[PDB]
Amino acid sequence: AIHYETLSKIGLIKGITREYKVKGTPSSKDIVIKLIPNVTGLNKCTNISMENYKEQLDKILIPINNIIELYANSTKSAARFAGVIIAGVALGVAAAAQITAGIALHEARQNAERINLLKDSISATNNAVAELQEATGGIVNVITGMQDYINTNLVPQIDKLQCSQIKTALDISLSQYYSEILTVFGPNLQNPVTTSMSIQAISQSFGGNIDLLLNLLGYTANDLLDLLESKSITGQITYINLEHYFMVIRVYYPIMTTISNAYVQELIKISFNVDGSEWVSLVPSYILIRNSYLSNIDISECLITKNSVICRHDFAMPMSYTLKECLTGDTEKCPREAVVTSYVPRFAISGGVIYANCLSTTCQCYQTGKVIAQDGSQTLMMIDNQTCSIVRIEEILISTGKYLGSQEYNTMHVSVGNPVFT
Amino acid sequence: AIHYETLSKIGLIKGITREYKVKGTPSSKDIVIKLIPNVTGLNKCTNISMENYKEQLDKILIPINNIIELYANSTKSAARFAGVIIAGVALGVAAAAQITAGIALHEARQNAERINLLKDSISATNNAVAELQEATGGIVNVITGMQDYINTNLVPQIDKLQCSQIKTALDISLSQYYSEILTVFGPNLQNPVTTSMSIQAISQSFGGNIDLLLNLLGYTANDLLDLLESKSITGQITYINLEHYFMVIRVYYPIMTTISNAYVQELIKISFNVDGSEWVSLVPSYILIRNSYLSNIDISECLITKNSVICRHDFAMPMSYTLKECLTGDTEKCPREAVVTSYVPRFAISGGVIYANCLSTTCQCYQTGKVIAQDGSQTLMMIDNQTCSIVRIEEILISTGKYLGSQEYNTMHVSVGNPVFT
Amino acid sequence: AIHYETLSKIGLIKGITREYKVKGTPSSKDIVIKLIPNVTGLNKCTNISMENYKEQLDKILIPINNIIELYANSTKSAARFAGVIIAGVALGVAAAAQITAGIALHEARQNAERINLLKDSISATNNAVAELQEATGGIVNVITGMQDYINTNLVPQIDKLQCSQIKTALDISLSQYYSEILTVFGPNLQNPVTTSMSIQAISQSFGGNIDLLLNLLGYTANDLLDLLESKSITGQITYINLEHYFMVIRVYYPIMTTISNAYVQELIKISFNVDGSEWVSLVPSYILIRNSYLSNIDISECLITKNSVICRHDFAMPMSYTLKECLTGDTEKCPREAVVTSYVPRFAISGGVIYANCLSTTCQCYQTGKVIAQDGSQTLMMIDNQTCSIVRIEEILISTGKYLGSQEYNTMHVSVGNPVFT
Ligand SMILES: *[C@@H]1O[C@H](CO)[C@@H](O)[C@H](O)[C@H]1NC(C)=O
Ligand SMILES: *[C@@H]1O[C@H](CO)[C@@H](O)[C@H](O)[C@H]1NC(C)=O
Ligand SMILES: *[C@@H]1O[C@H](CO)[C@@H](O)[C@H](O)[C@H]1NC(C)=O
Ligand SMILES: *[C@@H]1O[C@H](CO)[C@@H](O)[C@H](O)[C@H]1NC(C)=O
Ligand SMILES: *[C@@H]1O[C@H](CO)[C@@H](O)[C@H](O)[C@H]1NC(C)=O
Ligand SMILES: *[C@@H]1O[C@H](CO)[C@@H](O)[C@H](O)[C@H]1NC(C)=O
Ligand SMILES: *[C@@H]1O[C@H](CO)[C@@H](O)[C@H](O)[C@H]1NC(C)=O
Ligand SMILES: *[C@@H]1O[C@H](CO)[C@@H](O)[C@H](O)[C@H]1NC(C)=O
Ligand SMILES: *[C@@H]1O[C@H](CO)[C@@H](O)[C@H](O)[C@H]1NC(C)=O
Ligand SMILES: *[C@@H]1O[C@H](CO)[C@@H](O)[C@H](O)[C@H]1NC(C)=O
Ligand SMILES: *[C@@H]1O[C@H](CO)[C@@H](O)[C@H](O)[C@H]1NC(C)=O
Ligand SMILES: *[C@@H]1O[C@H](CO)[C@@H](O)[C@H](O)[C@H]1NC(C)=O
């Protein structure tokens, strides 16, 4: 829908076209995270109680468990239709986000309560990572923080150091650990009943070592890194065991869906001449095109890759009528901002040819040494190999190809919009 | 003041009511932070000088000390009124923020200079945490970084490793430490004469272990975690000893005050029908109500909890007249934004009943299988148990209660405002 | 150009004047960063392969190398003019930012390929930091992560711990390392062909220890800390050796240039009386003045110091005509915002004298105890030592000097602009 040949006359140069992708329905796996380390390897020091640490955890876990228990009590299985019934009255107030998550919680807990049957086997581990066998032949991946520090730095020195020295080292390392998770699972976790908690925030519970988790889950996808960086991989707390201080976390792993007839087009903005002074247009850099319709896209929440835009949601936004008219060729409605700085692009390469403002900078033909000048009635000069094979702009020598489009481009005039301030 | 029954007709559904709280007058305690570690346990390696490290610290501490000394010199005790006199001429230019802090500095230094009498006892420590006894029977809590690393990882290996290996390990760990505090106490600290430096930034001087500090200060309050996350706990540098490279920090611990007749009301926004297309209103999610007056609140600087909003300041903001008229029932002045995405809430639960847009999604009665339809003249359909006990929205079964309010709600019509773009 | 005596009547009080500085042409040095550690000290444990780690690195390095190789192939040396010729056709689409960087890449690689001749000597190191001698007598600084951990924590325990315990410790520490650099050199690195990648992001490849790097480069400048915090020090990836898994990084070290006749003037904003209610003006806090012209400055991207503003670019922005008229004395065009909070400055010191709103707060003369009152027709009261030597504002005693300017200030009236909402 965008008329590029005319928009380039006001500094909007067609850039790279990318496919639009949004995540779809996830698969899921359950893991167990243990918050209290095994310190029996330090049992030569009888003054270690771990009592203060347990109390500190209660202040975090109980406030959370009280919410999970509410939704778990409110939902029951369903009859003309199959499904799960959630009690609107019991909740009183709920947004669609928590209603949907509440249903997911109900289903997830049907397995979390089976994992809990291993609570004694979960507590009885001393490795940073352990694999427990379920009665059904399934495998539970247990991730415990602190164990690496204890096993490598404290236990080996149990005879070398004094017991007061070891206790001190342990008390400090535990308070450091607590400070780290408090940030994620403390008061900042407004409502645990969600399916969109970033896995990179959850991973803070074991040092922020996201790679360790992904390797254990067994995610080997070639695009795994893109799913991770786009924040498409998330998890949910489904069960908390307060006595043994461990959590059951469900990890959701999305399937990326490419949207048909949908892509994101970027524009390269350079300055141009209007009346002797230098101006830059105020058109959004990224435009989302679907079927044939123009809309805005909030790229700040998406991952930009070599050939695609990966979003965890559809971030399309409404576009004004004046901007749509601008993009379709009515350049009289494209707003301008004055340039008061030196830090502005004055040239770009697109389609193998150069678009440049040769009044604000100097353009010379390498072959002859002659200056490539534009008049005061022109916005931008377009340079191709029918004009000069190699052009020197500033002190950069750029070779060019042929221009595909109108051959009267440099004799074409364009109207401009009004000056605005932001 | 807000008329909820009419606003719900345009997708503004009453949510959770929270109390408004702002911090009041703090109490205070003094701590000492030492920047240079005790490496005499490594005195078998004679090539350790710590000289380069000291020079690096000078580049941070002197620029700060030069400001503290200025205010300390400018303030003197006071006479019709008691108090402290600050010299406006000596300062030349000062904002109220620094004038107030300057007075606090004067008072704090009356104790910091008494702590400094222990400068030899402060330097003569080798533990990460030490408690020194003052002549008056008071206790000074000394927190030192690096000591944990040195005592646990370097000293125990003094005979096992070569002295060049140990020196290298120490030089690297010190440069890592320096890099961390440089971030907080370097050029980014524009002016040290303040009472609002976050305690979580100060804690970077000893690894970011905020829990260690709080445990030593003896803060056991049940709401301590909320005070910390709301950034209500702050500190001030009151004294710097350049020769022995340590700082005296005053920690301010606020008392939360609940504001009478003041609360924050949240609204849940869902889409609604206007003319066949789908729209969302542009009314702020959080409204601050005081006595009977409406105002805006900058929630981005406050902590949102289950039943309160905790702010370090009063973040009330002016509200326009058109928005006040909107909120009090004149829905013709409530601006609309078009929906161009699929990622929008189309239903919510409030008061035990469901508000939903049954044109954009499908609503069925579980009991009969019949569709619950709304006409093209309606914005939203409200569903209660006088209509259908269990309603299937999408594929989620929700049970409902009775609606408290007008029983003619679903036959009531509302005017809407104009379309706008943002 | 700013008329301060009249603007102070509406709460805009002249603050501190700072010089405007922007970075100029850099010098450069090359360093080598190795991604795979030397684990031959652990060769008693035969189950260490490092194979999985290598594959994980390939997923990061290859996507980057494919871009560097493209620009390296496109550029060739140049003939009426000397220089480097870049192929616009081969690239197809490029912004000025990448065209310029592409030229820098060409030149840098002329040395990177000479460093690569030491690829066997680079791999054959086991220290965290090593200095290799080039055939030309030059020195290559090789920085390797992981070596500190391995040499200090794993190797010394090779006989003490079981080999399965050591392998586990190594596998975990490597996955932690990978997670850290993935953040910087993964998908978030949209295009490696740039000269503006922050050195503090690059330093993440070796723990974020920026001080270690700077010490090795030999930067001893007194203003080094300001260059670092202002983000003026950057680097570029010039060469990647995939077989030996190391990168050659060029570090650019800028020369700060003070701009003639250019400075940034800050204004201190306090509230004032208009008609009995309290108001605050909506004029930008920082104004950039060049020669004699007023413009806006985006201070959010600059470092503010005691006497200067240090920017990596020129961040001047256009200023509206209504604001220029406001600043030059037409106070009728200076917009007002209502105060609905208690958290607002009501006084400030500038020029040794006090400007205060003595209707919203209480002002008393220390010497006599009498109240210093202003009428309802006045905005602000200015207090100097010709009125009262020491004034008590709130409970703060401030001494004053003489006012330099009109002696009829307190009998001068000012017009105000219209109320606005934001
Ligand atoms: C435990 O600590 C106490 C001091 O509080 C000490 O007297 C006791 O000997 C310690 N226990 C052991 C086994 O050392
Ligand atoms: C959930 O139900 C159990 C009884 O089965 C009860 O003990 C628990 O307190 C309830 N939790 C909540 C939040 O109501
Ligand atoms: C600690 O771990 C050890 C070794 O796995 C196990 O024998 C012991 O039962 C565990 N103890 C606790 C308290 O979990
Ligand atoms: C200009 O470039 C095109 C390829 O883009 C080529 O076919 C044509 O021959 C070239 N013309 C000249 C004069 O170099
Ligand atoms: C200190 O370092 C020097 C090398 O600079 C070395 O010759 C000397 O032996 C070292 N001192 C000791 C006690 O090893
Ligand atoms: C403060 O006064 C002392 C003398 O008591 C002087 O040595 C010091 O330099 C002064 N500091 C400042 C910032 O003026
Ligand atoms: C280092 O600490 C030790 C043990 O507390 C003490 O004996 C010594 O005086 C301290 N030395 C220095 C230089 O502070
Ligand atoms: C509807 O719910 C209310 C409680 O909110 C209950 O008192 C009433 O009997 C219910 N009516 C029906 C038909 O279920
Ligand atoms: C390497 O690991 C295997 C188990 O996978 C073990 O059987 C073998 O003994 C180990 N090698 C050595 C030298 O211990
Ligand atoms: C660059 O040229 C070399 C041949 O010299 C080729 O092997 C390599 O694949 C080319 N790289 C790119 C990106 O074209
Ligand atoms: C590892 O480092 C050692 C000691 O510098 C060196 O002898 C050896 O060749 C290195 N091995 C590898 C694989 O780089
Ligand atoms: C007021 O202060 C000035 C210096 O700013 C001084 O010269 C003058 O004598 C002072 N006047 C009185 C009455 O204190």
TrEMBL record, chains A, B, C:
Keywords: Coiled coil, Disulfide bond, Fusion of virus membrane with host cell membrane, Fusion of virus membrane with host membrane, Glycoprotein, Host cell membrane, Host membrane, Membrane, Signal, Transmembrane, Transmembrane helix, Viral envelope protein, Viral penetration into host cytoplasm, Virion, Virus entry into host cell
Main subcellular location: virion
Localization: Virion membrane; Host cell membrane
Membrane topology: Single-pass type I membrane protein; Single-pass membrane protein
GO annotation (BP), single: symbiont entry into host cell
Disulfide linkage: 45-163, 302-311, 326-334, 358-363, 365-388
Residues carrying sugar: 38, 47, 73, 385
A GO cellular-component term linked to this record: host cell plasma membrane
Top-rank lineage group of the source organism: Viruses
Assembly mode: Homotrimer of disulfide-linked F1-F2.
Family that this chain belongs to: Belongs to the paramyxoviruses fusion glycoprotein family.
Protein name: Fusion glycoprotein F0
Organism this protein belongs to: Ghana virus
Source taxonomy: Viruses, Riboviria, Orthornavirae, Negarnaviricota, Haploviricotina
Gene encoding the protein: F
